[PDB]
Structure 1
Amino acid sequence: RQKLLKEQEEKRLREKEEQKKLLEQRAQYVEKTKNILMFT
């Protein structure tokens, strides 16, 4: 049972990894929409 719990919270960490990578990618998209602007 404890092993199941630790696996569950590990999967929640692995979700948080994708969440923070998405936040990263939007963070650079804010800089780069400017670039699309001056390009387009």
Structure 2
Amino acid sequence: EKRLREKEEQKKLLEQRAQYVEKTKNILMFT
């Protein structure tokens, strides 16, 4: 169960990566 929860942590981490790769272009055209 702890392994599943850490895997959910990893999937959330890659989800934040998958949205950060969108957010960097907005930060780029910001300045």
Q: What TM-score results when the alignment is normalised by the length of structure 1?
A: 0.74
CA RMSD of aligned residues (A): 0.5
Identity %: 100
Kindly report structure 1 stretches of 4+ aligned residues shifted beyond 2 Å: none
Provide the TM-score with structure 2 as the length reference: 0.92
How many residues in Structure 1 have an aligned counterpart in Structure 2? 31
Larger C-alpha radius of gyration, 1 or 2?
Answer: 1
Structure 1: any 5+ residue segments left out of the alignment?
1-9
Structure 2 residue runs of 5 or longer lacking an equivalent are: none
